[PDB]
Design a binder for this molecule. Structure first.
Ligand code: MTA
Ligand code: MTA
Ligand code: CL
Ligand code: CL
Lengths: 231, 231
């Protein structure tokens, strides 16, 4: 068999299209408040789950995937807010690096985003990111590669957008990527974080998020499936 | 044998006294960027580790303790900032409930601290908290029981203190308790979060934190050991 693959979203809406697109029989397995969908696709075991929103939920679920299910790589798929003009609604990006943008130990003179015995930026798989870019090029679709900023707040203001761009040079904002990628690094598991834009993280981001959740989630899911087809 | 006990701190300084106080032989076992210290004490297996600071670190470590080591209860020991006049430097409290004070999905009209498919407050073990209070009473020391607010920022301002008190009626602030307790709840593992005050979470909190880390960490550790002696 091929290498077992964990596939993660944050919300049920992000994994519904994934389950449908793979089209195989899934066994549901409950663990730690999550439901894991276990199946076989192209001679690979795939484990699919949504974590629920935010850093704690996604850290927990990723750790479970690795420790309880023994996944050998993790692909994350979902929606995000754009911080750059060139990332429009529905556009895709993969995270070259991620940061926890809400971490603040500045009282001890640490840079924002930094925690002792850790680092500001978290790395992802160069191999998976390069695969993503090749697939995008062949499909003739755009694919940005940049920094994704993750925190436990839904960002919907110009001020916070300006901070994320100025402090971290982030291209997009969401609430799970950094934690998923962090856990994968700690366990030596290759990770790719893929996001489709559904809003511009500004004052109207809530309405845009609602309008485009279904389409953006499907866009990311379809692309994730195209990556698995090449693995 | 008795029930296996996980013992957690956030920083090395918080677990050093724990290891010394138990005084038994520990085997060091690395996993996921953490070092777990495994030993036997009063016919109980104890697993001791520091998570590193913050929600992601502590979520990861707690999940590892439960999934990889199969602990049957988790006791957390460490230092915190006071939000109430009656909690002075060195004073102890146990968390009756915890909240993630930096969670903000208000763009979707959710209450602060709330995430869909979750809850604002996380519960802890009534049994362990009651044990703590009995021990405190017998030792003739004060022990507060209240809400602990956890977030990924070191709090050092009157404005943020006022928010924590007004929004959550929190008694103390720290950066790991809510995540540890959250993971324990998801896995059905009893949890007690114990903290000793080392600062007042105000403009001078950084200096106070440094001055009292050693003493406050030891105060919490000694009390945690006294609980284990009754288990
Ligand atoms: C309902 S909370 C937003 C959910 O969508 C993602 N997301 C999309 N746009 C944004 C944004 N503007 N700010 C934060 N997270 C975002 C986050 O990862 C989370 O799972
Ligand atoms: C060095 S970051 C502070 C460490 O001590 C705890 N802590 C103590 N006082 C405070 C405070 N004022 N604000 C946040 N965390 C605190 C947090 O849980 C963390 O592990
Ligand atoms: Cl905002
Ligand atoms: Cl503050």
């Amino acid at each position: 068999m091929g290498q077992k693959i964990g596939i993660l979203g944050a919300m049920r809406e992000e994994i519904t299209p994934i389950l449908e697109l793979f089209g195989v029989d899934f066994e549901e397995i409950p663990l730690g408040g999550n439901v894991f969908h276990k199946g076989v696709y192209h001679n690979k075991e795939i484990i699919v789950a949504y974590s629920k929103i935010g850093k704690v939920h996604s850290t927990l679920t990723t750790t479970s995937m690795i420790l309880a299910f023994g996944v050998q790589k993790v692909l994350f798929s979902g929606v995000a807010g754009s911080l750059v003009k060139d990332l429009k609604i529905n556009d895709l990006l993969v995270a070259t690096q991620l940061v926890q943008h809400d971490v603040d130990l500045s009282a001890f003179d640490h840079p924002l985003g930094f925690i002792p015995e850790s680092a500001i930026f978290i790395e992802t798989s160069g191999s998976l990111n390069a695969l993503a870019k090749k697939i995008a090029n062949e499909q003739h679709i755009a694919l940005k590669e940049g920094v994704i900023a993750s925190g436990d707040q839904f960002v919907h203001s110009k001020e916070r957008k300006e901070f994320l761009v100025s402090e971290f040079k982030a291209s997009a904002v969401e609430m799970e990527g950094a934690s998923v990628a962090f856990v994968c690094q700690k366990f030596g598991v290759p990770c790719c974080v893929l996001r489709s834009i559904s809003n511009n993280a500004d004052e109207k981001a809530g309405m845009s998020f609602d309008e485009f959740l279904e389409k953006s989630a499907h866009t990311s899911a379809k692309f994730l499936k195209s990556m698995v087809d090449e693995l």
